[PDB]
């Protein structure tokens, strides 16, 4: 089963993927999703990439503060103290993520689908 | 004119959780309730009582720290930090003091019900 896996995950009609995990098969292509603020809800399947780290070389939002909507591309992960960073370049530099602030917009969530979408 | 709030930062109740999050009041939508942006770039209404207008959150408030796979983890705050547009606090608990950015610290409804009286909408 998809039950303790690591995934981006949308929720709601804004339409943005963000870090979770499935904590439960709710039945009807229904998983439960703890995000990693710690907000628990169900999702579809359809709305579930299962990438767990998002790859190199994938176009992401980066978030930080005031900055909604920053654009930049995987260039490096890195395992510190039980904790995923991601090496997000944009404009020729690269800067440090946390997990949870690395979110997919629709059209970037959907370049994943083929690959990675639970269904 | 103009509601004195507006562009602010605050910490704002998630009514599913009770849990309060990092984010700015965009504007003032009447019947007392504001229109929240939270860090992760959601935006909904949020009613006055549930928005605390704290930037950064006290010195010696008890806060939950986000990091990965924790999500009830308790801690203190100690000292701010302010480093190319970001806020990071220095959060305390037990024998470690270690940096959490602003977005990974967030309030329990007992914690923010501390900070309600002097703080909050
Ligand atoms: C609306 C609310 C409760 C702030 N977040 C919904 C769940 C998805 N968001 C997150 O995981 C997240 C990511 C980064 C920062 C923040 Br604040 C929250």
Redesign the pocket.
């Known amino acids: 089963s998809f039950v303790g896996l690591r995934v981006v995950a949308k929720?709601?009609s804004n339409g943005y993927f963000?870090?979770?995990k499935i904590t439960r098969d709710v039945g009807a292509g229904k998983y439960k999703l703890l995000?990693?603020?710690?907000?628990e809800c169900d999702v579809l399947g359809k709305d579930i990439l299962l990438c767990d780290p998002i790859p190199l070389d994938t176009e992401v939002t980066a978030?930080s503060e005031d900055e909604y909507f920053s654009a930049g591309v995987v260039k490096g992960h890195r395992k510190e103290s039980g904790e995923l960073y991601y090496s997000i370049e944009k404009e020729g530099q690269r800067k440090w993520y946390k997990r949870?602030?690395v979110?997919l917009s629709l059209e970037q969530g959907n370049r994943l689908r083929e690959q990675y979408g639970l269904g």
């Open positions: 929720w709601s963000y870090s979770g995000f990693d603020d710690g907000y978030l949870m602030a979110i």
